[PDB]
Amino acid sequence: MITNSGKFGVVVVGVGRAGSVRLRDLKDPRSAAFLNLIGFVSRRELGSLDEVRQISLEDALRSQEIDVAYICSESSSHEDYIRQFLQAGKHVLVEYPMTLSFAAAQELWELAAQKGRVLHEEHVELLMEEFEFLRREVLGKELLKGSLRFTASPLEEERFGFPAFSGISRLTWLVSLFGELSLISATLEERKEDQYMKMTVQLETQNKGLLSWIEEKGPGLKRNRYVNFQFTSGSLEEVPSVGVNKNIFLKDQDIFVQKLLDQVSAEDLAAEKKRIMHCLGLASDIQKLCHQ
Numbered sequence: 001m002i003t004n005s006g007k008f009g010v011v012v013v014g015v016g017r018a019g020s021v022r023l024r025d026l027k028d029p030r031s032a033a034f035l036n037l038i039g040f041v042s043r044r045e046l047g048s049l050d051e052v053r054q055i056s057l058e059d060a061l062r063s064q065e066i067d068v069a070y071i072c073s074e075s076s077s078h079e080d081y082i083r084q085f086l087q088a089g090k091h092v093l094v095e096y097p098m099t100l101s102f103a104a105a106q107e108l109w110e111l112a113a114q115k116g117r118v119l120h121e122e123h124v125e126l127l128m129e130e131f132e133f134l135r136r137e138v139l140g141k142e143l144l145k146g147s148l149r150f151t152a153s154p155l156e157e158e159r160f161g162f163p164a165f166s167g168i169s170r171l172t173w174l175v176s177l178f179g180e181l182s183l184i185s186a187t188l189e190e191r192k193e194d195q196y197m198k199m200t201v202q203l204e205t206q207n208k209g210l211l212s213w214i215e216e217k218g219p220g221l222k223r224n225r226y227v228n229f230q231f232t233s234g235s236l237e238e239v240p241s242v243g244v245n246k247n248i249f250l251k252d253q254d255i256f257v258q259k260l261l262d263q264v265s266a267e268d269l270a271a272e273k274k275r276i277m278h279c280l281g282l283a284s285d286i287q288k289l290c291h292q
């Protein structure tokens with residue numbers, strides 16, 4: 001018999017850590033009712049991964065069975081892939097940062113609207129158990145001053161982008177919790193000899209709260225997050241982690257599916273886009289302050 005599936009055909013682009021996780025999740029029962037994994041695109045000659053076939057980029061853009069593209073490649077290639085798939089009429093889910101350029105991001109949102117497609121930038125950091133804790137903590141409190149520092153191993157800027165972009169998840173935490181921020185200063189310390197880098201950013205909330213955001217990367221440095229928020233009524237210097245954020249990417253996919261089903265209000269869609277663009281704008285400005 002001839003039956004037209006009501007499910008959205010998905011192609012995963014880039015099979016690194018994120019891509020592998022997306023492929024795994026697309027096989028989960030939580031993905032069964034609305035999504036159909038068609039294949040994956042890779043710059044390497046894999047041919048297939050288990051029962052999932054590799055499809056050339058050219059064929060993926062042409063295929064009428066593909067309705068959605070998950071862009072999981074390195075940051076520097078996101079812009080190009082997003083543009084090609086939107087132009088081809090496919091909905092797009094892309095891992096943050098969607099681009100390494102504010103202007104480029106503006107262009108892509110406009111293109112998505114033009115083609116009537118959903119463009120979704122994944123931000124699992126807002127779905128973390130640790131963030132739920134912070135959301136409850138800041139509720140009804142006035143931020144006087146605070147600091148958020150994240151340390152980790154070296155990361156190739158050429159592939160993942162400038163630190164403000166590669167670590168935009170930390171900035172997203174701050175903007176989500178305290179609203180739009182104004183940039184006061186930004187400094188970048190680079191010791192390529194020791195594969196070391198430290199970016200220090202000073203931001204200000206609309207309530208005069210002063211925030212310090214530091215991103216540090218160096219050999220041997222363990223992945224650590226330091227939080228210190230001082231409020232007018234109470235303080236916070238530690239965020240517990242008792243879970244492992246299981247199925248966090250499926251939670252993000254669930255949001256994307258709600259958009260595909262057109263079950264997200266215009267207001268919610270607008271608020272999210274405004275936040276995304278504000279963060280990308282700040283990252284872009286921070287880069288200029290550090291490089292110029």
Ligand SMILES: NC(=O)c1ccc[n+]([C@@H]2O[C@H](COP(=O)([O-])OP(=O)(O)OC[C@H]3O[C@@H](n4cnc5c(N)ncnc54)[C@H](O)[C@@H]3O)[C@@H](O)[C@H]2O)c1
Pocket residue numbers: 001002063064065
């Ligand atoms: N055409 C190509 O070269 C090519 C290459 C790759 C993928 N595809 C994909 O294949 C799908 C369709 O083309 P296809 O030929 O490959 O698939 P297909 O025709 O081999 O699919 C077969 C299924 O359709 C049913 N069916 C088809 N015509 C029927 C009829 N008249 N009466 C009763 N049942 C019928 C069969 O019984 C069977 O369940 C699309 O999803 C397309 O993207 C096509």
Ligand SMILES: NC(=O)c1ccc[n+]([C@@H]2O[C@H](COP(=O)([O-])OP(=O)(O)OC[C@H]3O[C@@H](n4cnc5c(N)ncnc54)[C@H](O)[C@@H]3O)[C@@H](O)[C@H]2O)c1
Pocket residue numbers: 016017018019072073074075095096097124152155160165166167
């Ligand atoms: N891997 C994740 O958990 C995750 C979460 C959100 C966004 N992303 C984005 O996915 C794309 C590539 O991701 P990948 O992990 O699949 O490729 P990858 O497999 O090439 O990554 C190799 C290494 O880089 C690290 N890494 C990747 N993106 C990073 C980032 N923004 N900041 C700090 N370390 C990072 C990984 O954890 C891993 O140790 C990038 O655009 C990235 O920002 C990845």
